[PDB]
Amino acid sequence: INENVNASKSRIKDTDFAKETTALTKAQILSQASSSVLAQAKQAPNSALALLG
Amino acid sequence: MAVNVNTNVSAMTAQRYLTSATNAQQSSMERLSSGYKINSAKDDAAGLQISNRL
């Protein structure tokens, strides 16, 4: 039972590295895109104002 | 993306698990060399009393 409860003490509490790391990298890439998307949106109001001096 | 540099809670949490993880590991490398799983009363106080009596 000690072996069985330790086996059940995994995928319940113990994390895996296979599916969770690609979620970490996906989130990190998403954060990279999310930080970059505002870098292409900050100049949009400036260009909008640029029609008139 | 949440910009912040005056604090890094991710590093603080990682350090908190860092300290706890190899604190127990530091308790190792000594039980192996000594050959005893009891070396200090802070580990198992009840075990120390009975082990000394035995």
From Swiss-Prot, chain A:
Subcellular localization(s) per the UniProt record: Secreted; Bacterial flagellum
Outline what the protein does.
Flagellin is the subunit protein which polymerizes to form the filaments of bacterial flagella. FlaC is not essential for flagellar synthesis and motility.
Protein family: Belongs to the bacterial flagellin family.
- What do we know about how this protein assembles, alone or with others? Heteromer of multiple flagellin subunits including FlaA, FlaB, FlaC, FlaD and FlaE.
Instruction: Reproduce the miscellaneous comment text.
Output: V.cholerae is able to differentially regulate the flagellins within the flagellum maybe to produce flagella which are particularly suited for motility within a given environment.
Q: What is this protein called?
A: Flagellin C
The species is Vibrio cholerae serotype O1 (strain ATCC 39315 / El Tor Inaba N16961)
Tell me the gene name.
flaC
Range covered out of full length: 325 to 377 of 377
UniProtKB/Swiss-Prot annotation, chain B:
Give the UniProt subcellular location, in the record's own words: Secreted; Bacterial flagellum
Please state which protein family the record places this protein in: Belongs to the bacterial flagellin family.
Q: What else is known?
A: V.cholerae is able to differentially regulate the flagellins within the flagellum maybe to produce flagella which are particularly suited for motility within a given environment.
Describe its function. Flagellin is the subunit protein which polymerizes to form the filaments of bacterial flagella. FlaC is not essential for flagellar synthesis and motility.
User: Subunit info?
Assistant: Heteromer of multiple flagellin subunits including FlaA, FlaB, FlaC, FlaD and FlaE.
Q: What is this protein called?
A: Flagellin C
**From which organism does this entry originate?**
Vibrio cholerae serotype O1 (strain ATCC 39315 / El Tor Inaba N16961)
The stretch of the full-length protein covered here is 1 to 54 of 377
